[PDB]
Amino acid sequence: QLQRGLHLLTDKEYKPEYFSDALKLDAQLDYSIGGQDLSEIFEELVKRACEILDCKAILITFDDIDTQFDAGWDVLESIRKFFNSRKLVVVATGDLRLYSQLIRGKQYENYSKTLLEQEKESVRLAERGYMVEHLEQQYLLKLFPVQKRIQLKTMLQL
Amino acid sequence: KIIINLFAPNLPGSTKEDDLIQKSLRDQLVESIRNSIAYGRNVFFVDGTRGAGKTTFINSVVKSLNSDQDDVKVNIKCLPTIDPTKLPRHEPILVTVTARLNKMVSDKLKGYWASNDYRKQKEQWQNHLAQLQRGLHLLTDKEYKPEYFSDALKLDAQLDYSIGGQDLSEIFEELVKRACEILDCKAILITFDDIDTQFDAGWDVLESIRKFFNSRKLVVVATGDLRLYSQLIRGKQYENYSKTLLEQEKESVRLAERGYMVEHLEQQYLLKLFPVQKRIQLKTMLQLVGEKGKAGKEEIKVKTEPGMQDIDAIDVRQAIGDAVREGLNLREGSDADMYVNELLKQPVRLLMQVLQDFYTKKYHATSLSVPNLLRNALYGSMLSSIYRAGLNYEQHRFGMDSLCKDIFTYVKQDRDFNTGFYLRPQSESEALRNCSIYLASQVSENCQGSLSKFLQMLLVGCGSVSIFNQFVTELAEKFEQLISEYVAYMSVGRIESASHWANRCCAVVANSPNDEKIGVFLGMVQLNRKSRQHMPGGYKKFNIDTENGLAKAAMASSLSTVASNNLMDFCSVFNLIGAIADISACRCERSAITNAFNKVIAQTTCIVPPWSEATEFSDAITKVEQWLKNVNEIEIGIRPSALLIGKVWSRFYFNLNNVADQHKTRLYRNAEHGRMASQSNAAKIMRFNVLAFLHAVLVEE
Amino acid sequence: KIIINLFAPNLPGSTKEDDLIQKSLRDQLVESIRNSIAYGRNVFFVDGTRGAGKTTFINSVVKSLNSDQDDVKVNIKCLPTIDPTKLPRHEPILVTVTARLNKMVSDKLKGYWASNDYRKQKEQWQNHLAQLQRGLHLLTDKEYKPEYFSDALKLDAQLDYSIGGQDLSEIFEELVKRACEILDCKAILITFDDIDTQFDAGWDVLESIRKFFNSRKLVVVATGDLRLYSQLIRGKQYENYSKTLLEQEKESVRLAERGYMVEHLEQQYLLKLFPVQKRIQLKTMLQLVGEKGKAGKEEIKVKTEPGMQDIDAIDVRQAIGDAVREGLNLREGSDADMYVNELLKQPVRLLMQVLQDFYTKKYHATSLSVPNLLRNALYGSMLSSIYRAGLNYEQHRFGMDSLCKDIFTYVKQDRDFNTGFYLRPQSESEALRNCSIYLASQVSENCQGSLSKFLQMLLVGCGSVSIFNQFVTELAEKFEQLISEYVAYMSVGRIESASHWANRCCAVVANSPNDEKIGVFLGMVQLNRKSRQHMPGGYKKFNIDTENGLAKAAMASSLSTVASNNLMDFCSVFNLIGAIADISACRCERSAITNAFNKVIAQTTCIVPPWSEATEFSDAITKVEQWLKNVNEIEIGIRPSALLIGKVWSRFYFNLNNVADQHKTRLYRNAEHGRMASQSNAAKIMRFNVLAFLHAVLVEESLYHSVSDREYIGEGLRLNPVTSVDEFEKKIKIIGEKLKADNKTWKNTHPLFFLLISCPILHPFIFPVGGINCSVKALNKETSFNKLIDEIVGDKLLSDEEWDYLTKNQQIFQNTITSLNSSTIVGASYDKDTPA
Ligand SMILES: Nc1ncnc2c1ncn2[C@@H]1O[C@H](COP(=O)(O)OP(=O)(O)OP(=O)(O)O)[C@@H](O)[C@H]1O
């Protein structure tokens, strides 16, 4: 059933023919939310895997996006969209000021390119920077709670 | 009459019957939602305090609506809350709503008992559902194909549509009507989460509400920021203009009316999508109760101690008022009340949570260090604010060295170097407006139960901003460079002793020139290392050897020599206070007395600031080693606050300006021993310096 | 008879007869449409801005024409209204029109009785639909194909088709002609809804009308905004140009003509599609109600509460006025209806959502704080303007801090620093004119039932605007940087107390470069902090300990110290106003009043701004509490407004300009006595400074305070006296004989003025020792002037001997300042004498 819904992750457009397969409740799993929800399907997939593996939680670990920090947007999006369960623990590594630079670039992509070019005055541009800074500081707060953030110490601090 | 149990076995991470506090408005909001059904596009917008429980409230809104079905005269069925950000990048909202509407209908269909009703409704649903499937290509098509015209002319429909065309607005309108009949409800509630963390996905939400969700059987509750929804709508209006018109008309006369038209387009877009009378404001704690004198809008109580009955419960304002006063060492007045109002503006879940952490740990602690107790309770709920403020977020670094840095950076970020060391929550940004109480609790704890740590903030933590305010003017990123190197010279991050901070403080004040170069500056007088010939009266040079016990070591502690292009000798009250900190911090052992005693008689040169262009003592030893015996029991009594430390220095700093002004302006030749106030000398000024310190301590305490 | 029900849904779908704002237009548009058919393109246009009610109006026209189908001799069949914004993105308008027309024809075919005509006309309709089906690709093709040519030469269509080219215009013309035969109508009304939501979609509507709707059997009515259609049309004529020519001919000699040529193309395109004689403008609510004196075009009424009948309705002009008269605390006059006029000119959607959110929350509260009810309405209604204007948006911060910051930024963009703090909706911009009434609702609510907050607006809100204008602006980008320093220095939006702001304001008046080095600044005097030789008369260094109770405390607040190169003590009048604001905030406890008097004098270290290059004391608190308790019993009924607060400051600020220079030179050697008006020593400068504020609160509040409906100042000249008391005295005298005629008190009429004239701090400043003029006529006016103050206050300020000692040149005073006149002002070298 996860393979049936993987097209949503990679589709470049919506196919109206898939609406007939987004309406079937033939699955005995009885997913609470209607329609094929990749977040929901992965939840019982992880819940099933915990019973098979006989463990309370599964630890998903990600390396640091250093040689290519554009690849970390999928990591950030997959954590919030899918890896949100009591059975899942996520640990990520990387420069926080590099993830912030990555999130900041994405928050600027939600602005229409016409608006950016046609509103260059300081009063509007400054407000855009305040909104983007506020938008991406809350993104990091939701994705990475501060009480769970851990900073690696250097020799001078060791 | 809401009673909040802080010690209830229920975890605060879930929503239950009146577990939150907004339920006074939620009932009217539920009533208002049902009010619009008795008679259209009913779209309610939900907002609140910045970063409040937006997701939490709407989940409780639909929870309280799906429960009561028959006991309520008007029935409303609620879809699961739709998060447009956690949706497929191309899946339409109409598909998402239908996919969740289909399951609610299907589950009700499986709940039918009669086959006669079940069969006729199931085929009516599927015939309605197949009509929507035949038209979903209209949403996604990038080009019109001629074969769709035959579909648009297919009038062989028992559904009896109003208009001829293949309008998805009326196909979905009839689909909702059938869903209402199956679910036996007058309306269906569609709720959307905030469009934050990806706000380009909220356009599909806005367009779906505008075009498809404008039926009288549909209620839409949207959540988010109107400032961000305005930002989205504004951008789409510009894209209506042709790119050639924008490029070929860039003159300000046309560029202004172009922007004066779009701002009119977004103004009427929100007023149409979200009517003002339907916009909902999530009240904060302060609005729910009001002020101390103003009559309470709705009495709300908090169980301070476990097992306490409803009659013995106290108001929320005094629940945090007692907590804040105990932790911040503040009297029952207006200084602590403005902190109470500051905490009353926090999110309603955060206010109950910070109360729980303080009280629950208090019960365990008693079964004390209340300022320490409030810091840990505030840290759990404010840790977001400290991290974004660049302050000390390291849970084990909450000591004395880090406190000096925190006060410095807080003043710099808040941009008030004359009153920012009072640590009042007068800032505008949430992070700085919330870091005051945390820093006030840090000061109220690090200095509580000690004497040397009172001066270690008055002279260092709080005294570093008044010197800077006397420093920035004479000099004015370069300003950003100035503060970074200002910390390094004072060693604000790492003070080994308060006698060294004042040792380098005299070299800073002396750098600034005076009028006529009298040799008098803030709280100090410039002594001369070499004698002046032919001085009327007895104005000789200074030699330390002339003084006696408790008059030589004390003067040596106040003495300070700064090496520059010209060697200079200085005496200051600040150097005298630095000697007090070393002695107070040192132990009661007589062998441990000398290390602080010798250090204040070290007579070591002080480097000029980088930015500048440049046993006889046993009589004193027994007194200082006996006074610190008296210090130990007194230290327990004193409970300093951040307000007290700033206030004492504020009068102390201001008075030294007057002392250095009322004595340098009287030029004299025979006023060694002052018989009248119109006479002054080197020693007479230092009389009023310590009196300025003692009087300031007296009045403010 | 138009009765708008505010508690009704009030939506285009739910709008019926008897509550249509546009009814004369609907009646006359139908007649014009009918006459054009009784006698090419027949296209009508209904114009109007966004929210003017185009969708509501045009639906009624369809309803009006649909009713009485057979009865009207001229027959018109109306298709359902087409909304271009809600249509599918890529479908043609011709498809939408035909699909709706097909259903109308189809339902008529199924209504026939004879089986022959139904069968005959069904195939004729299907034949035309098949022809249209065949040719729709001509619209949606990205290129031509050779095999289409064989389709163009097919002349076996069996219809006339006078021209053979597979012309979609002619195919639709015959399809419409056939549709009229089946429907038995003279014409078919195609209706288009406004495109204001997305005007990009309006190009296909415009193109379809001229290409396909040219039949005499078709009549078209379209709604929208011509200035919105113009930018749509003009944006397409720019696409007809070759791009390469655009960069190459970038010279201003050709770019001007190119912009000229597009104007001619747009002008005729709008004239080609919509003839001027067919256009109709949707009248604004103001244009339908007129003004007070002149009767409006229609007499519209509104319903403010549910459950009433139509006879209980009131006119919209009154209903908006009541929300302005009460919500903004304005009496009837030229400034109240002028707020209503600005709201009437607003779009109907914006006006309804003000008149709804106000009364919906007013009937659900009364079953109060009317200024708060209006403020909530104008916060969301003007919300988009607030974001554009860069104001404060958080409702959980709607307090004194945010309001004083909004005023400075509102005039920072309004380009009106002189009188822009009235928040008058007179700006040329639309956003700033919208925020002019939202910020005015801020003032009328945050100052309702208060005096400390009212003075805070007067001193910090209006004050910081004026002090910036005449003392900081001369140094100014720099202007943005200067405001970044002025606001930060003066702490606008984050003040601790009004006196703390005053301790900084008094520096700013002195920080600006002033010539002649005279210490008589604007609203303050720089008393010398030291002394030297050559001091004539009884002139010496200023002493604070010389004064007695209620004389030390009154001036202790008044003193300010700036930490310049040399510390400079400043005595001002803003400090007195700042202290009163701080004291009026204090409650009935005497343990906190002593903090108010002492937080202002000590610990004051006001560094120069970056842009600057360089027990009798207990006998006063019992009087303060007798006045503080008098504040809390009368201040509840205080109803101030943004106009009144600004107007009071306007009269107040002008006097300080007069006293600054009218007394600057009048300092002579024999000025200590102050017997003659020529002498203007420091005890007379501040006597009139306080008398300036009391007079500003006297006349201005007697003009605009909403509690009073009858003018009490009366007809005359208002000269706000300097160097005189006569005209100040007479106005109090005139009101006294006028209040007595109406048997009306001195408290309900002037709650604002009474509590300031009875302020204990201001009393020792009304009659100082180096004050009162001592000529034969000066004592004549001042004898009654002192009596008048005692009468209105209710208790004597000076006894019989106290007045006699002041007039005739020792007995100490517990209610009069003594040492002020002996003090000398910096830069005032008394090298001359008073002329005789
Ligand atoms: N005749 C009327 N009676 C009562 N209220 C009216 C009337 N005309 C307009 N309104 C109010 O003004 C609003 C204006 O909406 P309307 O749709 O009529 O205008 P529009 O902006 O031209 O249309 P659209 O919604 O298509 O953009 C209505 O929603 C309603 O609140």
Token digits of residue A48:
């099933």
- What is the spatial distance between Cα B410 and Cα B646, in angstroms, rounded to a whole number? 14
In chain C, the residue whose alpha carbon lies closest to the alpha carbon of A126 is C390
Question: Taking CB atoms and an 8 Å cutoff, what residues of chain A touch B226?
Answer: none
For residue C396, which of A132, B527, B341 has the smallest C-alpha distance?
Answer: B341
CA C28 / ligand 1 centre spacing (Å): 20
Residue C302 and residue C316 in contact, taking contact as beta carbons nearer than 8 Å: yes
- What are the start-end ranges of the E strands in C233-298? 279-281
Q: How far apart are CA B600 and CA B553, in angstroms?
A: 8
Residues B323, B326, B332, B335: is their CA dihedral positive or negative? negative
The whole-angstrom separation of Cα B641 and Cα B458 is 11
At a CB cut-off of 8 Å and minimum separation 6, what does A26 contact? Answer: none
Amino acid at position C727, single letter: E
CA angle C346–C351–C354, rounded 5-degree value = 130
Which B residues in the span 50-79 are in contact with C, Cβ-Cβ below 8 Å? 50
Among protein residues, the one with the nearest Cα to ligand 1's atom 29 is C11
- Three-class secondary structure of residue C82 per DSSP: strand
Task: Count CB neighbours of B9 within 10 A.
Answer: 5
Q: What tokens were used for A25?
A: 């409740």
Which candidate from A115, A131, A141 shows the least CB-CB separation from B235? A115
Contact (Cβ atoms closer than 8 angstroms) between residue C530 and residue B665: yes
Q: Which residues contact B533 (CB under 8 A, 6 or more apart)?
A: none
Q: Which residues pair with B559 in a beta bridge?
A: B571
CA B93, CA B90: separation in Å to the nearest integer? Answer: 9
Q: How far apart are CA B312 and CA B521, in angstroms?
A: 59
> DSSP characters for B392-438?
---TT--SSHHHHHHHHHHHHHHT-TTTGGG--S--SSHHHHHHHHH
b/e code B68-85 from CB counts within 10 Å (16+ = b)? eeeeeeebbbbbbbbbbb
Atom nearest to C223 CA in ligand 1: 22
Q: Kindly report the protein residue whose alpha carbon is nearest to atom 5 of ligand 1.
A: C10
**DSSP 8-state class, residue C461:** I
In b/e form, how buried is each residue of C459-496, taking b as 16+ CB within 10 angstroms?
A: bbbbbbbbbbeebbeebeeeeeebbeebbebbbbbbbe
Question: Using CA atoms, how far apart are residues B147 and B172, in angstroms rounded to an integer?
Answer: 22
**C449 in reach of chain A (CB within 8 A):** no
Among C6, C56, C195, C343, name the best residue to mutate to test ligand 1's pocket (greatest count of ligand atoms within 8 A of Cβ): C56
Contact A13 B102 (CB under 8 A): no
Instruction: Please report which residue ranges of B521-641 form alpha helices under DSSP H.
Output: 553-558, 573-585, 590-599, 618-637
Does an H or E element contain B662, and which?
helix B642-662
CA C498, CA B235: separation in Å to the nearest integer? 43
Amino acid in the structure at residue B530:
K
Distances (CA, A) of B556 to B504, B510, B597, C516: 16, 18, 10, 49
Q: Is ligand 1 within 6 A of the CB of residue C84?
A: no
In the block, residue with structure tokens 């920072």? C412
The verdict on a CB contact (< 8 Å) between C200 and B240 is yes
Q: How close does chain C come to A83, measured CA to CA in Å?
A: 34
**C537 touches A at CB < 8 Å:** no
β C314-315/C300-303 pair status: antiparallel
Take residue C684 and report the two structure tokens written for it: 């007379």
Q: What is the token pair recorded at C681?
A: 């020593």
Name the one residue in this structure whose structure tokens are 């005739």. C808
Q: What is the DSSP pairing of strand B568-572 with strand B314-315?
A: unpaired
Determine whether the shortest distance from the Cβ of C47 to ligand 1 is under 6 A: no
- The rounded distance, in Å, linking the Cα atoms of A37 and A82 is 10
A34/B101 CB distance under 8 A: yes
CB contact at 8 A, B499 and B603: no
Hey, what amino acid is at C443?
Answer: V
- The closest alpha carbon to C182, from C80, C101, C64, C71, belongs to C101
Give the rounded distance of the alpha carbon of C685 from its chain centre.
37
Experimental method: cryo-EM
> Does B227 reach chain C within 8 Å, measured CB to CB?
yes
Which residues share a beta bridge with A59? Answer: A89
Whether the Cβ atoms of residue C51 and residue C168 lie closer than 8 Å to each other: no
- Residue C655 is encoded by which pair of tokens? 């006097």
C264 phi-psi bin (left φ>0, alpha ψ -120 to 50, beta other): alpha
Question: Residue B262 has which token pair?
Answer: 């779009």
Instruction: Let me know: does B208 contact B101? Beta carbons within 8 Å.
Output: no
Show the tokens assigned to C75.
């027959």
Q: Nearest Cα to C40, choosing from C189, C215, C212?
A: C215
Give dist(CA B46, CA B282) in Å, integer.
7
As a whole number of Å, the CA-based R_g of chain B is 36
Q: How far does the CA of residue A124 sit from the closest CA of chain C (Å)?
A: 8
Beta bridge partners of B44: B221
C16's tokens:
């019926």
Residues C707, C326: Cα–Cα separation, whole Å: 11
Strand C2-5's sheet: what is its strand order?
C2-5, C300-303, C314-315
Is C390 in CB contact (< 8 Å) with chain A? yes
Long-range contact pairs involving C534-538 (C-beta distance under 8 Å, separation at least 24):
C535/C824, C536/C669, C536/C830, C537/C669, C537/C670, C537/C671, C537/C672, C537/C830, C538/C672, C538/C822
Residue C585 is encoded by which pair of tokens?
């905030």
Partners of B219 in the β-ladder? B42, B189
Report the side by side order of strands in the sheet with B187-191: B76-78, B187-191, B218-223, B42-47, B279-281
**Ligand 1 atom with the shortest distance to the CA of C352:** 31
| Spatial distance between the Cα atoms of C751 and B128, rounded to a whole number of angstroms | 69
Asked if A112 has any chain C CB less than 8 Å from its own CB, the reply is no
**DSSP character string of C734-751:** HHHHHHHHTT--SSSS-H
Which residues does residue B479 pair with via DSSP β-bridges, in sequence order?
none
Q: What is the resolution of the experimental data for this entry, in Å? A: 3.0
Residue type, B534: H
Give which of B478, B507, B447, B459 is closest to B641, Cα–Cα.
B447
Tell me the DSSP string of C337-393. Answer: HHHHHHHHTS-HHHHHHHHHHHHHHHHHHH---HHHHHHHHHHHHTHHHHHHHT---
- Please spell the DSSP secondary structure of B268-287, one letter per residue: HHHHHHS-GGGEEE---HHH
Cβ-Cβ pairs closer than 8 A, A with C, add up to 3
CA nearest ligand 1 atom 8, residue: C53
Tell me C460's DSSP state: I
Q: Considering just the CA atoms, what is the radius of gyration of chain C in Å?
A: 37
CA B315, CA B2: separation in Å to the nearest integer? Answer: 10
A125 touches chain B (CB under 8 A): no
B483 contacts B423 by C-beta, under 8 angstroms:
no
Using CA atoms, how far residue C207 sits from B458, C101, C169, C233, in Å, is 78, 19, 12, 10
At residue C215's C-alpha, the angle toward residues C209 and C218, to 5°, is: 75
Q: In sequence order, which residues have a C-beta less than 8 Å from that of residue A158 and are 6 or more positions away?
A: none
CA distance C500 to B314: 36
Tokens standing for C720? Answer: 């706000």
User: Could you tell me which residues are beta bridge partners of residue C45?
Assistant: C222, C279
Two tokens, residue C425: 């909706």
Out of B136, B255, B387, closest to residue A146 by CB: B387
Q: How far is C409 from chain B (nearest CA, A)?
A: 16
What's the CA gap between B122 and B106, in Å, rounded? 8
DSSP H/E element including C4: strand C2-5
Q: How far is CA C717 from each of CA C464, C712, C713, C722, C781, rounded to the nearest angstrom?
A: 29, 13, 10, 14, 18
CA distance C317 to C285: 9
DSSP 8-state class, residue C303: E
Tokens 């365990």 — which residue?
Answer: B364
Q: How crowded is residue C681: how many other Cβ atoms within 10 Å of its Cβ? A: 32
Task: Tally C-beta pairs within 8 A across B and C.
Answer: 215
Contact C424, C643 (CB under 8 A): yes
Interface of B with C in 195-224 (CB under 8 A): 210-211
Chains touching chain A, criterion 3+ CB pairs below 8 Å = B, C
Q: Kindly state if the Cβ of C54 falls inside 6 Å of ligand 1.
A: yes
Distances from the Cα of C313 to the Cαs of B193, C3, C4, C347, C352, in angstroms? 41, 7, 9, 22, 16
Sign of CA dihedral B420, B422, B425, B426: negative
- Residue C776: count of CB within 10 angstroms of its CB: 6
Residue B473 neighbours by CB under 8 Å, 6+ apart: C607, C608, C610
The 3-state DSSP class for residue B301 equals: strand
Interface test mutation site (partner B, options C82, C364, C383, C453, max chain B beta carbons within 10 A): C383
Residue C235 sits at the chain A interface (C-beta within 8 Å): no
Measured in degrees and rounded to the nearest 5, phi and psi for residue C471 equal -135, -15
Q: List the subunits that have 3+ CB pairs under 8 angstroms with C.
A: A, B
Q: Is the Cβ atom of C194 under 6 angstroms away from ligand 1?
A: yes
Helix (H) or strand (E) holding C265: helix C252-273
Compute how many other C-beta atoms are within 10 angstroms of the C-beta atom of residue A154: 7
Bridge partner list, B301: B3, B315
CB contact burial B127-152 (16+ within 10 A = b; e otherwise):
ebbebbbebbbbbebeebebebbeeb
Sheet strands side by side (includes B300-303): B2-5, B300-303, B314-315
The residue type of C569 is: D
Ligand 1 centroid – CA C53 distance (Å) = 4
List C residues 664-693 in contact with A (Cβ-Cβ < 8 A): none
Say if residues C636 and C449 touch (Cβ distance below 8 Å): yes
Helix (H), strand (E) at residue C45: strand C43-47
Please indicate if any CB of chain B lies within 8 Å of the CB of A26: no
* Chain B CB within 8 Å of residue A146 CB: yes
